[model samples]
Target chain A: RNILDNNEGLYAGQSLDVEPYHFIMQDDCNLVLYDHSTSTWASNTEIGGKSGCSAVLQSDGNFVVYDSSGRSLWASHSTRGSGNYILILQDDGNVIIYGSDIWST
Target chain B: RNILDNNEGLYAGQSLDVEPYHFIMQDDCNLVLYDHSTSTWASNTEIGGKSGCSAVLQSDGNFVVYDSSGRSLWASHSTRGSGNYILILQDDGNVIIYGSDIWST
Candidate 1:
Protein backbone atom coordinates (compact mmCIF):
# COMPACT_ATOMS: atom_id res chain seq x y z
CA ARG A 1 0.00 0.00 0.00
CA ASN A 2 1.19 3.54 -0.80
CA ILE A 3 0.30 6.32 1.58
CA LEU A 4 1.68 9.77 0.80
CA ASP A 5 0.96 12.49 3.31
CA ASN A 6 1.44 16.21 2.82
CA ASN A 7 4.64 18.32 3.25
CA GLU A 8 7.33 15.77 2.33
CA GLY A 9 8.43 13.54 -0.51
CA LEU A 10 8.42 9.84 -1.31
CA TYR A 11 12.22 9.55 -1.36
CA ALA A 12 14.66 7.80 -3.75
CA GLY A 13 14.65 4.39 -2.09
CA GLN A 14 10.95 3.99 -2.88
CA SER A 15 9.62 2.01 -5.83
CA LEU A 16 6.50 0.35 -7.02
CA ASP A 17 7.14 -3.36 -7.57
CA VAL A 18 10.90 -2.84 -7.60
CA GLU A 19 10.59 -0.85 -10.82
CA PRO A 20 13.70 1.22 -10.03
CA TYR A 21 12.27 4.74 -9.82
CA HIS A 22 10.81 7.24 -7.41
CA PHE A 23 7.26 8.37 -6.69
CA ILE A 24 7.70 11.92 -5.56
CA MET A 25 4.79 13.87 -4.17
CA GLN A 26 6.63 16.76 -5.82
CA ASP A 27 7.07 20.20 -4.34
CA ASP A 28 5.15 21.68 -7.23
CA CYS A 29 2.35 19.77 -5.56
CA ASN A 30 2.16 16.92 -8.03
CA LEU A 31 2.62 13.26 -7.30
CA VAL A 32 4.20 11.22 -10.08
CA LEU A 33 5.42 7.73 -10.90
CA TYR A 34 8.35 7.78 -13.29
CA ASP A 35 11.54 6.14 -14.52
CA HIS A 36 14.40 8.26 -15.92
CA SER A 37 14.15 7.02 -19.49
CA THR A 38 11.34 4.65 -20.29
CA SER A 39 8.09 6.40 -19.34
CA THR A 40 6.10 8.66 -17.06
CA TRP A 41 2.91 6.66 -17.19
CA ALA A 42 0.60 8.41 -14.75
CA SER A 43 0.17 11.36 -12.42
CA ASN A 44 -2.46 11.99 -9.76
CA THR A 45 -2.27 15.67 -10.55
CA GLU A 46 -4.99 15.14 -13.11
CA ILE A 47 -7.98 17.43 -12.67
CA GLY A 48 -6.40 20.62 -11.39
CA GLY A 49 -2.79 21.11 -10.40
CA LYS A 50 -2.92 21.98 -6.76
CA SER A 51 -0.10 23.49 -4.77
CA GLY A 52 -0.05 22.33 -1.15
CA CYS A 53 -2.43 19.42 -1.62
CA SER A 54 -3.11 16.17 0.19
CA ALA A 55 -4.54 12.76 -0.57
CA VAL A 56 -5.71 9.85 1.47
CA LEU A 57 -6.65 6.39 0.26
CA GLN A 58 -8.82 6.47 3.36
CA SER A 59 -9.37 3.73 5.83
CA ASP A 60 -12.83 3.50 4.30
CA GLY A 61 -12.38 2.46 0.69
CA ASN A 62 -12.04 5.90 -0.93
CA PHE A 63 -9.13 7.64 -2.51
CA VAL A 64 -9.39 11.40 -2.29
CA VAL A 65 -7.28 14.09 -3.87
CA TYR A 66 -7.69 17.62 -2.57
CA ASP A 67 -6.08 21.03 -2.23
CA SER A 68 -4.29 22.86 0.60
CA SER A 69 -7.06 24.92 2.15
CA GLY A 70 -9.89 22.69 1.10
CA ARG A 71 -10.88 19.31 -0.32
CA SER A 72 -11.69 17.93 -3.78
CA LEU A 73 -8.97 18.77 -6.20
CA TRP A 74 -9.86 15.40 -7.71
CA ALA A 75 -10.68 11.93 -6.49
CA SER A 76 -11.50 8.31 -7.40
CA HIS A 77 -15.14 9.19 -8.04
CA SER A 78 -16.21 6.66 -5.48
CA THR A 79 -19.10 6.61 -3.09
CA ARG A 80 -18.59 3.57 -0.93
CA GLY A 81 -21.46 4.44 1.41
CA SER A 82 -19.35 3.01 4.26
CA GLY A 83 -16.19 0.89 4.31
CA ASN A 84 -12.41 1.08 4.65
CA TYR A 85 -9.95 2.34 1.98
CA ILE A 86 -6.58 1.01 0.96
CA LEU A 87 -4.43 2.06 -1.99
CA ILE A 88 -2.25 -0.56 -3.57
CA LEU A 89 -0.14 -0.71 -6.72
CA GLN A 90 -0.19 -4.08 -8.42
CA ASP A 91 2.38 -5.98 -10.47
CA ASP A 92 0.15 -5.55 -13.50
CA GLY A 93 0.90 -1.82 -13.33
CA ASN A 94 -2.49 -0.89 -12.09
CA VAL A 95 -3.21 1.36 -9.06
CA ILE A 96 -6.13 0.17 -7.05
CA ILE A 97 -7.91 1.99 -4.23
CA TYR A 98 -9.81 -0.61 -2.30
CA GLY A 99 -12.00 -0.69 0.77
CA SER A 100 -14.81 -0.93 -1.65
CA ASP A 101 -12.90 -1.18 -4.92
CA ILE A 102 -13.76 2.44 -5.64
CA TRP A 103 -11.06 2.97 -8.23
CA SER A 104 -8.47 1.17 -10.32
CA THR A 105 -6.20 1.98 -13.25
CA ARG B 1 3.40 14.96 -31.22
CA ASN B 2 4.93 16.55 -28.09
CA ILE B 3 8.11 18.50 -27.64
CA LEU B 4 9.13 19.62 -24.15
CA ASP B 5 12.16 21.83 -23.84
CA ASN B 6 14.26 22.60 -20.81
CA ASN B 7 13.16 24.85 -17.90
CA GLU B 8 9.41 25.05 -18.49
CA GLY B 9 6.13 23.19 -18.22
CA LEU B 10 3.65 21.82 -20.75
CA TYR B 11 0.78 23.77 -19.20
CA ALA B 12 -3.02 24.13 -19.44
CA GLY B 13 -4.82 23.66 -22.76
CA GLN B 14 -2.16 21.07 -23.33
CA SER B 15 -2.98 17.40 -23.18
CA LEU B 16 -2.26 13.99 -24.65
CA ASP B 17 -5.39 14.17 -26.84
CA VAL B 18 -7.93 15.43 -24.32
CA GLU B 19 -7.24 12.86 -21.65
CA PRO B 20 -7.58 15.95 -19.41
CA TYR B 21 -4.12 16.25 -17.88
CA HIS B 22 -0.81 18.08 -18.01
CA PHE B 23 2.68 16.85 -18.74
CA ILE B 24 4.83 18.98 -16.50
CA MET B 25 8.59 18.97 -16.99
CA GLN B 26 8.71 19.79 -13.29
CA ASP B 27 11.46 21.92 -11.76
CA ASP B 28 12.70 18.92 -9.85
CA CYS B 29 13.60 17.90 -13.39
CA ASN B 30 11.08 15.14 -13.82
CA LEU B 31 8.82 15.43 -16.84
CA VAL B 32 5.40 14.26 -15.74
CA LEU B 33 2.05 13.60 -17.42
CA TYR B 34 -0.71 13.59 -14.83
CA ASP B 35 -4.36 14.40 -14.31
CA HIS B 36 -5.92 15.59 -11.05
CA SER B 37 -6.56 11.96 -10.39
CA THR B 38 -6.39 8.57 -12.17
CA SER B 39 -2.58 8.10 -12.22
CA THR B 40 1.05 9.11 -11.87
CA TRP B 41 2.29 6.63 -14.42
CA ALA B 42 5.67 7.41 -15.86
CA SER B 43 8.68 9.70 -15.68
CA ASN B 44 11.95 10.44 -17.46
CA THR B 45 13.74 10.84 -14.12
CA GLU B 46 14.28 7.14 -14.04
CA ILE B 47 17.86 5.83 -14.24
CA GLY B 48 19.98 8.37 -12.38
CA GLY B 49 17.93 11.33 -11.22
CA LYS B 50 19.26 14.59 -12.52
CA SER B 51 18.07 18.11 -11.82
CA GLY B 52 17.73 20.63 -14.66
CA CYS B 53 16.83 18.17 -17.40
CA SER B 54 15.57 18.58 -20.93
CA ALA B 55 14.03 16.57 -23.75
CA VAL B 56 13.69 16.91 -27.46
CA LEU B 57 11.45 14.87 -29.72
CA GLN B 58 13.66 15.77 -32.65
CA SER B 59 12.00 16.00 -36.03
CA ASP B 60 14.07 13.06 -37.23
CA GLY B 61 12.09 10.57 -35.11
CA ASN B 62 14.21 9.96 -32.04
CA PHE B 63 12.99 10.96 -28.61
CA VAL B 64 15.85 11.84 -26.28
CA VAL B 65 15.89 12.48 -22.53
CA TYR B 66 18.78 14.40 -21.11
CA ASP B 67 19.98 16.84 -18.44
CA SER B 68 20.20 20.67 -18.52
CA SER B 69 23.96 21.06 -18.80
CA GLY B 70 23.93 18.88 -21.96
CA ARG B 71 24.13 15.13 -22.84
CA SER B 72 22.23 11.92 -22.06
CA LEU B 73 20.23 11.34 -18.90
CA TRP B 74 18.16 8.64 -20.56
CA ALA B 75 16.97 7.89 -24.09
CA SER B 76 14.80 5.58 -26.12
CA HIS B 77 16.36 2.13 -25.94
CA SER B 78 16.09 2.64 -29.65
CA THR B 79 19.04 3.00 -31.92
CA ARG B 80 17.18 4.52 -34.85
CA GLY B 81 20.29 4.23 -37.03
CA SER B 82 19.88 8.02 -37.70
CA GLY B 83 16.55 9.83 -37.84
CA ASN B 84 14.71 12.66 -36.15
CA TYR B 85 12.88 12.03 -32.87
CA ILE B 86 9.19 12.65 -32.38
CA LEU B 87 7.54 12.17 -29.02
CA ILE B 88 3.85 11.54 -29.40
CA LEU B 89 1.23 10.56 -26.91
CA GLN B 90 -1.21 8.29 -28.70
CA ASP B 91 -4.93 8.27 -27.97
CA ASP B 92 -4.89 4.78 -26.53
CA GLY B 93 -2.75 6.24 -23.70
CA ASN B 94 0.69 5.57 -25.05
CA VAL B 95 3.62 8.01 -24.81
CA ILE B 96 5.82 7.00 -27.70
CA ILE B 97 9.32 8.20 -28.40
CA TYR B 98 10.04 7.31 -31.99
CA GLY B 99 13.01 7.46 -34.27
CA SER B 100 12.76 3.83 -34.02
CA ASP B 101 9.72 2.64 -31.94
CA ILE B 102 12.27 2.51 -29.12
CA TRP B 103 9.94 3.26 -26.20
CA SER B 104 6.25 3.38 -25.28
CA THR B 105 3.73 2.65 -22.52
Candidate 2:
Protein backbone atom coordinates (compact mmCIF):
# COMPACT_ATOMS: atom_id res chain seq x y z
CA ARG A 1 0.00 0.00 0.00
CA ASN A 2 1.10 3.58 -0.56
CA ILE A 3 -0.36 4.96 2.62
CA LEU A 4 0.15 4.44 6.33
CA ASP A 5 -1.90 5.86 9.19
CA ASN A 6 -0.79 6.75 12.69
CA ASN A 7 0.86 3.87 14.58
CA GLU A 8 1.27 2.07 11.27
CA GLY A 9 4.73 1.54 9.89
CA LEU A 10 7.02 -0.25 7.50
CA TYR A 11 9.18 -2.99 8.90
CA ALA A 12 12.52 -3.95 7.46
CA GLY A 13 12.19 -5.19 3.91
CA GLN A 14 8.81 -3.52 3.58
CA SER A 15 8.01 -0.59 1.33
CA LEU A 16 5.39 1.66 -0.18
CA ASP A 17 5.57 1.96 -3.93
CA VAL A 18 4.06 4.42 -6.38
CA GLU A 19 5.00 3.50 -9.96
CA PRO A 20 8.60 4.63 -10.41
CA TYR A 21 9.15 5.44 -6.77
CA HIS A 22 9.66 3.29 -3.69
CA PHE A 23 9.88 4.32 -0.07
CA ILE A 24 11.50 1.55 1.87
CA MET A 25 12.19 0.76 5.48
CA GLN A 26 15.49 -0.90 4.85
CA ASP A 27 17.17 -3.54 6.90
CA ASP A 28 20.25 -1.38 7.06
CA CYS A 29 18.31 1.04 9.27
CA ASN A 30 17.55 3.79 6.79
CA LEU A 31 14.29 5.05 5.38
CA VAL A 32 14.90 5.74 1.74
CA LEU A 33 13.16 6.94 -1.38
CA TYR A 34 14.21 5.27 -4.57
CA ASP A 35 13.41 6.13 -8.17
CA HIS A 36 13.80 2.72 -9.76
CA SER A 37 17.37 1.75 -8.90
CA THR A 38 18.41 5.29 -8.04
CA SER A 39 18.08 6.66 -4.53
CA THR A 40 16.60 10.14 -4.53
CA TRP A 41 16.50 10.73 -0.80
CA ALA A 42 17.10 8.99 2.51
CA SER A 43 16.90 9.44 6.25
CA ASN A 44 20.63 8.70 6.38
CA THR A 45 20.03 6.57 9.42
CA GLU A 46 22.02 3.61 8.24
CA ILE A 47 24.69 2.68 10.67
CA GLY A 48 27.02 -0.25 10.30
CA GLY A 49 25.93 -3.27 12.35
CA LYS A 50 22.40 -1.93 12.69
CA SER A 51 19.63 -4.05 11.24
CA GLY A 52 15.89 -4.74 11.32
CA CYS A 53 15.05 -1.09 11.35
CA SER A 54 11.50 0.18 10.96
CA ALA A 55 9.86 3.48 10.10
CA VAL A 56 6.79 4.60 11.95
CA LEU A 57 4.45 7.56 11.49
CA GLN A 58 3.57 8.28 15.08
CA SER A 59 0.42 9.68 16.66
CA ASP A 60 2.34 12.84 17.42
CA GLY A 61 2.81 13.54 13.68
CA ASN A 62 6.47 12.69 13.66
CA PHE A 63 7.87 10.07 11.33
CA VAL A 64 10.59 8.14 13.07
CA VAL A 65 13.10 5.44 12.28
CA TYR A 66 13.84 2.85 14.90
CA ASP A 67 16.39 0.12 15.27
CA SER A 68 15.67 -3.55 15.88
CA SER A 69 15.64 -2.85 19.59
CA GLY A 70 13.21 0.08 19.21
CA ARG A 71 15.78 2.78 19.59
CA SER A 72 15.13 5.91 17.56
CA LEU A 73 17.77 6.25 14.89
CA TRP A 74 16.33 9.14 12.93
CA ALA A 75 13.20 11.20 12.59
CA SER A 76 11.36 13.75 10.49
CA HIS A 77 10.75 15.83 13.60
CA SER A 78 7.53 17.22 12.10
CA THR A 79 5.59 16.80 15.31
CA ARG A 80 3.09 19.49 16.17
CA GLY A 81 0.42 17.97 18.39
CA SER A 82 -1.05 14.55 18.90
CA GLY A 83 -3.05 13.40 15.91
CA ASN A 84 -3.47 10.62 13.43
CA TYR A 85 -1.16 11.23 10.49
CA ILE A 86 -0.70 9.53 7.16
CA LEU A 87 2.44 8.76 5.23
CA ILE A 88 2.28 8.31 1.50
CA LEU A 89 4.57 7.55 -1.36
CA GLN A 90 3.47 9.98 -4.03
CA ASP A 91 3.35 9.56 -7.80
CA ASP A 92 5.67 12.56 -8.11
CA GLY A 93 8.45 10.50 -6.47
CA ASN A 94 8.15 12.28 -3.14
CA VAL A 95 7.46 10.45 0.11
CA ILE A 96 5.33 12.64 2.34
CA ILE A 97 3.99 12.49 5.85
CA TYR A 98 0.67 14.31 6.07
CA GLY A 99 -0.97 15.51 9.20
CA SER A 100 -2.49 18.95 9.67
CA ASP A 101 0.49 19.87 7.49
CA ILE A 102 3.08 17.94 5.43
CA TRP A 103 6.66 16.69 5.51
CA SER A 104 8.59 14.95 2.76
CA THR A 105 11.64 13.13 1.51
CA ARG B 1 26.28 30.52 3.49
CA ASN B 2 24.64 27.12 3.62
CA ILE B 3 22.63 27.96 6.70
CA LEU B 4 19.47 29.98 7.32
CA ASP B 5 18.22 30.89 10.75
CA ASN B 6 14.57 31.51 11.52
CA ASN B 7 13.29 34.60 9.68
CA GLU B 8 16.21 34.35 7.24
CA GLY B 9 15.50 33.60 3.61
CA LEU B 10 16.51 33.66 -0.01
CA TYR B 11 15.11 36.10 -2.54
CA ALA B 12 14.83 35.37 -6.25
CA GLY B 13 18.23 34.67 -7.79
CA GLN B 14 19.77 33.96 -4.41
CA SER B 15 21.41 30.65 -3.52
CA LEU B 16 23.39 28.53 -1.07
CA ASP B 17 26.30 26.72 -2.60
CA VAL B 18 28.37 23.83 -1.33
CA GLU B 19 30.79 22.67 -3.98
CA PRO B 20 28.89 20.62 -6.56
CA TYR B 21 25.53 21.28 -4.91
CA HIS B 22 23.61 24.51 -5.31
CA PHE B 23 20.28 25.23 -3.66
CA ILE B 24 18.75 28.20 -5.43
CA MET B 25 15.67 30.31 -5.12
CA GLN B 26 15.07 30.62 -8.82
CA ASP B 27 13.44 33.51 -10.60
CA ASP B 28 10.89 30.99 -11.90
CA CYS B 29 9.60 30.67 -8.33
CA ASN B 30 11.01 27.26 -7.47
CA LEU B 31 13.38 26.29 -4.72
CA VAL B 32 15.69 23.81 -6.40
CA LEU B 33 18.77 21.79 -5.67
CA TYR B 34 21.27 21.25 -8.43
CA ASP B 35 24.38 19.15 -8.61
CA HIS B 36 26.23 21.25 -11.11
CA SER B 37 23.76 21.54 -14.03
CA THR B 38 21.54 18.59 -13.04
CA SER B 39 18.67 19.22 -10.67
CA THR B 40 18.34 16.60 -7.95
CA TRP B 41 15.53 18.03 -5.84
CA ALA B 42 13.02 20.84 -5.90
CA SER B 43 10.14 22.44 -4.05
CA ASN B 44 8.35 22.32 -7.43
CA THR B 45 6.87 25.78 -6.91
CA GLU B 46 7.39 26.84 -10.49
CA ILE B 47 4.22 27.73 -12.33
CA GLY B 48 3.65 29.60 -15.54
CA GLY B 49 3.89 33.37 -14.94
CA LYS B 50 5.01 32.97 -11.35
CA SER B 51 8.11 34.87 -10.45
CA GLY B 52 9.88 36.93 -7.80
CA CYS B 53 9.49 34.15 -5.24
CA SER B 54 11.31 33.98 -1.96
CA ALA B 55 11.92 31.18 0.55
CA VAL B 56 11.89 31.84 4.26
CA LEU B 57 12.56 29.82 7.38
CA GLN B 58 9.78 31.10 9.58
CA SER B 59 9.99 31.38 13.34
CA ASP B 60 7.35 28.69 13.60
CA GLY B 61 9.89 26.28 12.08
CA ASN B 62 8.36 25.99 8.68
CA PHE B 63 10.36 26.64 5.57
CA VAL B 64 8.01 28.31 3.14
CA VAL B 65 7.99 29.53 -0.43
CA TYR B 66 6.15 32.75 -1.23
CA ASP B 67 5.18 34.19 -4.57
CA SER B 68 5.57 37.75 -5.67
CA SER B 69 2.24 38.62 -4.12
CA GLY B 70 3.38 37.11 -0.82
CA ARG B 71 1.11 34.11 -1.18
CA SER B 72 2.49 30.78 -0.07
CA LEU B 73 3.30 28.45 -2.94
CA TRP B 74 4.92 25.61 -1.05
CA ALA B 75 6.18 24.72 2.38
CA SER B 76 8.21 22.02 4.07
CA HIS B 77 5.22 21.57 6.36
CA SER B 78 7.49 21.05 9.32
CA THR B 79 6.07 23.48 11.79
CA ARG B 80 6.00 22.44 15.40
CA GLY B 81 5.69 24.63 18.48
CA SER B 82 6.97 28.10 17.59
CA GLY B 83 10.70 28.46 18.04
CA ASN B 84 13.94 29.51 16.42
CA TYR B 85 15.09 26.98 13.86
CA ILE B 86 17.81 26.59 11.28
CA LEU B 87 17.94 25.20 7.76
CA ILE B 88 21.15 23.84 6.40
CA LEU B 89 22.34 22.52 3.05
CA GLN B 90 24.65 19.65 3.82
CA ASP B 91 27.73 18.44 1.97
CA ASP B 92 26.06 15.08 1.49
CA GLY B 93 23.66 16.81 -0.91
CA ASN B 94 20.88 16.88 1.64
CA VAL B 95 19.08 20.01 2.77
CA ILE B 96 17.80 19.81 6.34
CA ILE B 97 15.89 22.04 8.74
CA TYR B 98 16.66 21.79 12.41
CA GLY B 99 14.65 22.90 15.41
CA SER B 100 14.17 20.57 18.36
CA ASP B 101 14.69 17.88 15.73
CA ILE B 102 15.00 17.65 11.96
CA TRP B 103 13.24 17.89 8.59
CA SER B 104 14.57 17.66 5.09
CA THR B 105 14.07 18.26 1.36
A1-105: candidate 1 lDDT, tens digit per residue:
232211222322333343444344444545555564444654456444556665554443445555677666555555454542334433334454323221111
Model 1: what TM-score?
A: 0.35
lDDT of 2 by residue, B1-62 (tens): 66566688999999988789899999999899999998999999899999999999898878
Model 1 chain A lDDT-worst window of ten = A3-12
Q: State how far residue B93 of model 1 sits from its true place (Å).
A: 39
User: CAPRI band of model 2?
Assistant: incorrect
**Where is the poorest 10-residue window by lDDT in model 2 chain A?**
A96-105
Residues A1-105, candidate 2: write the lDDT tens digits: 666666889999999877788888888888889898999999999898998889988878788899989899888888877654556565657565544422333
List where candidate 1 sits over 4 angstroms from the true fold: A1-17, A35-39, A43-50, A100-105, B1-105
